Amino acid sequence: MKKLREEAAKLFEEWKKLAEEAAKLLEGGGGGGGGELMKLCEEAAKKAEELFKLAEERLKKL
Protein backbone atom coordinates (compact mmCIF):
# COMPACT_ATOMS: atom_id res chain seq x y z
CA MET A 1 0.00 0.00 0.00
CA LYS A 2 2.96 2.29 -0.69
CA LYS A 3 4.62 3.93 -3.69
CA LEU A 4 8.13 4.38 -2.30
CA ARG A 5 8.42 0.63 -1.76
CA GLU A 6 8.46 -0.16 -5.48
CA GLU A 7 10.34 3.07 -6.19
CA ALA A 8 13.31 2.39 -3.91
CA ALA A 9 13.57 -1.17 -5.21
CA LYS A 10 13.92 0.32 -8.69
CA LEU A 11 16.74 2.65 -7.66
CA PHE A 12 18.69 -0.41 -6.52
CA GLU A 13 18.77 -1.62 -10.12
CA GLU A 14 20.25 1.69 -11.27
CA TRP A 15 23.50 0.81 -9.50
CA LYS A 16 23.70 -2.60 -11.18
CA LYS A 17 22.88 -0.93 -14.49
CA LEU A 18 26.15 1.00 -14.57
CA ALA A 19 28.01 -1.89 -12.95
CA GLU A 20 26.99 -4.30 -15.71
CA GLU A 21 28.03 -1.88 -18.45
CA ALA A 22 31.32 -1.26 -16.66
CA ALA A 23 32.08 -4.99 -16.54
CA LYS A 24 32.56 -4.81 -20.31
CA LEU A 25 35.09 -1.99 -19.96
CA LEU A 26 37.07 -3.92 -17.35
CA GLU A 27 37.26 -6.96 -19.62
CA GLY A 28 37.68 -4.99 -22.84
CA GLY A 29 35.25 -6.81 -25.09
CA GLY A 30 36.54 -10.27 -25.94
CA GLY A 31 36.53 -11.72 -22.44
CA GLY A 32 35.69 -15.27 -21.41
CA GLY A 33 38.86 -17.26 -20.85
CA GLY A 34 40.82 -15.53 -18.11
CA GLY A 35 38.73 -12.46 -17.39
CA GLU A 36 38.82 -12.08 -13.61
CA LEU A 37 38.42 -8.31 -13.93
CA MET A 38 34.86 -8.98 -15.11
CA LYS A 39 34.17 -11.18 -12.08
CA LEU A 40 35.37 -8.51 -9.65
CA CYS A 41 32.84 -6.00 -10.97
CA GLU A 42 29.98 -8.50 -11.08
CA GLU A 43 30.74 -9.30 -7.44
CA ALA A 44 29.62 -5.80 -6.47
CA ALA A 45 26.28 -6.13 -8.27
CA LYS A 46 25.85 -9.60 -6.77
CA LYS A 47 25.83 -8.08 -3.28
CA ALA A 48 22.75 -6.03 -4.19
CA GLU A 49 20.94 -9.30 -4.91
CA GLU A 50 21.78 -10.70 -1.47
CA LEU A 51 20.54 -7.54 0.25
CA PHE A 52 17.24 -7.59 -1.64
CA LYS A 53 16.41 -10.80 0.22
CA LEU A 54 16.55 -9.03 3.59
CA ALA A 55 15.12 -5.72 2.38
CA GLU A 56 12.19 -7.75 1.06
CA GLU A 57 10.84 -8.42 4.56
CA ARG A 58 11.95 -4.97 5.69
CA LEU A 59 9.60 -3.36 3.16
CA LYS A 60 7.05 -6.18 3.06
CA LYS A 61 5.24 -6.27 6.40
CA LEU A 62 4.26 -9.83 7.33
Added chain:
Amino acid sequence: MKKLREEAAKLFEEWKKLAEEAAKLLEGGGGGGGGELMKLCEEAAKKAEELFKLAEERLKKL
Protein backbone atom coordinates in the same frame (compact mmCIF):
# COMPACT_ATOMS: atom_id res chain seq x y z
CA MET B 1 48.06 7.97 -20.54
CA LYS B 2 45.73 5.50 -18.82
CA LYS B 3 44.26 2.42 -20.50
CA LEU B 4 41.51 0.91 -18.36
CA ARG B 5 42.94 -0.03 -14.97
CA GLU B 6 42.77 3.54 -13.66
CA GLU B 7 39.48 4.07 -15.50
CA ALA B 8 37.94 1.23 -13.49
CA ALA B 9 38.70 2.76 -10.09
CA LYS B 10 37.06 5.95 -11.38
CA LEU B 11 34.01 4.06 -12.63
CA PHE B 12 33.37 2.81 -9.09
CA GLU B 13 32.35 6.39 -8.29
CA GLU B 14 29.55 6.23 -10.85
CA TRP B 15 27.64 3.73 -8.72
CA LYS B 16 28.08 5.72 -5.51
CA LYS B 17 26.80 8.75 -7.41
CA LEU B 18 23.43 7.09 -7.98
CA ALA B 19 23.50 5.65 -4.46
CA GLU B 20 23.41 9.10 -2.88
CA GLU B 21 20.54 10.19 -5.13
CA ALA B 22 18.62 7.04 -4.22
CA ALA B 23 18.87 7.90 -0.52
CA LYS B 24 16.74 10.98 -1.20
CA LEU B 25 14.08 8.91 -2.95
CA LEU B 26 13.94 6.40 -0.10
CA GLU B 27 13.76 9.15 2.53
CA GLY B 28 11.29 11.23 0.54
CA GLY B 29 12.61 14.55 1.79
CA GLY B 30 14.10 13.56 5.13
CA GLY B 31 14.55 10.81 7.68
CA GLY B 32 13.07 11.43 11.11
CA GLY B 33 12.73 9.02 14.01
CA GLY B 34 15.78 6.98 13.10
CA GLY B 35 15.15 4.99 9.94
CA GLU B 36 17.08 1.87 8.95
CA LEU B 37 15.99 2.10 5.31
CA MET B 38 18.47 4.95 4.92
CA LYS B 39 21.21 2.97 6.66
CA LEU B 40 20.62 -0.06 4.44
CA CYS B 41 20.95 1.98 1.25
CA GLU B 42 24.25 3.40 2.48
CA GLU B 43 25.68 -0.06 3.20
CA ALA B 44 25.56 -0.90 -0.51
CA ALA B 45 27.56 2.21 -1.41
CA LYS B 46 29.85 1.57 1.56
CA LYS B 47 30.98 -1.74 0.08
CA ALA B 48 32.15 0.02 -3.09
CA GLU B 49 34.42 2.29 -1.05
CA GLU B 50 35.73 -0.69 0.92
CA LEU B 51 36.50 -2.54 -2.31
CA PHE B 52 38.83 0.26 -3.42
CA LYS B 53 41.26 -1.02 -0.80
CA LEU B 54 41.28 -4.54 -2.24
CA ALA B 55 41.36 -3.27 -5.82
CA GLU B 56 44.37 -1.10 -4.97
CA GLU B 57 46.46 -4.12 -3.97
CA ARG B 58 45.13 -6.13 -6.90
CA LEU B 59 45.38 -3.84 -9.93
CA LYS B 60 48.43 -2.26 -8.30
CA LYS B 61 50.84 -4.86 -6.91
CA LEU B 62 53.94 -2.73 -6.32
